[PDB]
């Protein structure tokens, strides 16, 4: 879990790889691992998740109780979620005077959230709120506390990361939000 | 009115000076480097370039560098070095908290350093590094950056540390899909006028080259 970076971009993961990642990480013993899956479409791969991780098998009950789903349409709502996660972490660290809490924050659709706020507010306000929320998630995941941790993963389709795939070897108007984050906020990209 | 000075005055200082790594020699004369106190690096890199790493990982003995790590890179557990003290706090990721912290460091170094979990005060603070000023970004922006410069200049006058800062080049400030569209970085002159050396890093091929910006 401590393999994960403070913020990692996962491009176009297949539904099977994502299910498998969740299953392996949330079945670790002697720790409480939670997945907060935050998305702009309500598209958690539930049908595949149920096949790979059947909720009718008693071993799987806890995994389902430790996944939290939120549909989040803009950066304002993402900032509010980030508030709630930081309340959860803070209160866990406090109360730890018991098994460590490990949160995986997984956000899909962040480019769509940015696009929504951008149209409801201003280009400056959008970039400012994006910046505040990601810098906050970095300092949160960097905290040396052993009782509660967070790691964030950002999913984007490959076609929004062409600067990466073209580097790793077109006509362009600026960076996509994915390229901008790859360059300015994310520690790594996991293929 | 006659003044006669021991030569030892000219070779002794209560201030630290920045020792440029190889990557950065041949930019300024030996006299100019004999006294770099404020250096700003512009680089497009999220993580520190090798020249920046070299400037920073430059601990002699009981000497320490305070690294104000707005980007949460330098203080990550696997990145941390023995010669550094770190400030990586949700109270110190915007320009208002950064200035409150630096004002405390000037007024009461012990109290400010306690925030960085310094148990023992057996060291000389050699330098302060702030990474990345591009994340602190009207005309109120000019005011805050002059206030930042002025406190850093006061710090250097009292504690003797040198100062190194970093920002992203002009590209970052274009924003996502160019929706936010001098120097090759968007910092005010109220800040830049204060720098003894401004370095710019660019890739012209896949080769990074460092150049002075006397812009």
Curated annotation (Swiss-Prot), chain A:
Keyword Protein transport set for record: no
Additional information: Present with 414 molecules/cell in log phase SD medium.
The gene coding this protein: CSM2
Keywords of the record: Cytoplasm, DNA damage, DNA repair, Meiosis, Nucleus
Organism from which the protein derives: Saccharomyces cerevisiae (strain ATCC 204508 / S288c) (Baker's yeast)
One record GO biological process: error-free postreplication DNA repair
Family, as annotated: Belongs to the CSM2 family.
Protein name: Chromosome segregation in meiosis protein 2
Entry GO terms, CC: cytoplasm; nucleus; Shu complex; site of double-strand break
Function: Involved in chromosome segregation during meiosis. Promotes efficient recombinational repair and functions in the protection of the genome from spontaneous and induced DNA damage like mutations and gross chromosomal rearrangements (GCRs).
UniProt keyword Nucleus present: yes
CDD domains recorded: Csm2 (cd19478)
Localization terms from the record: Cytoplasm; Nucleus
Binding partners and assembly: Component of the SHU complex composed of at least CSM2, PSY3, SHU1 and SHU2.
Swiss-Prot record, chain B:
BP-aspect Gene Ontology terms: DNA recombinase assembly; error-free postreplication DNA repair; error-free translesion synthesis; positive regulation of single-strand break repair via homologous recombination; recombinational repair
Cellular component aspect of the GO annotation: cytoplasm; cytosol; nucleus; Shu complex; site of double-strand break
Gene3D superfamilies recorded: P-loop containing nucleotide triphosphate hydrolases
Tagged with keyword Nucleus: yes
The protein, known as: Platinum sensitivity protein 3
Localization terms from the record: Nucleus
Pfam families named among the record's database cross-references: PSY3
Other comments on record: Present with 876 molecules/cell in log phase SD medium.
Subunit and interaction comment: Component of the SHU complex composed of at least CSM2, PSY3, SHU1 and SHU2.
Organism: Saccharomyces cerevisiae (strain ATCC 204508 / S288c)
Biological role stated in the UniProt entry: Required for resistance to the DNA-damaging agents methyl methanesulfonate (MMS), cisplatin and oxaliplatin, but not to mitomycin C. Plays a role in protection against mutation accumulation. May be a component of the recombination-repair pathway.
CDD domains referenced in this protein's UniProt entry, alphabetically: Psy3 (cd19480)
Entry keyword annotation includes Cell wall biogenesis/degradation: no
Alphabetically ordered keywords of this record: DNA damage, DNA repair, Nucleus
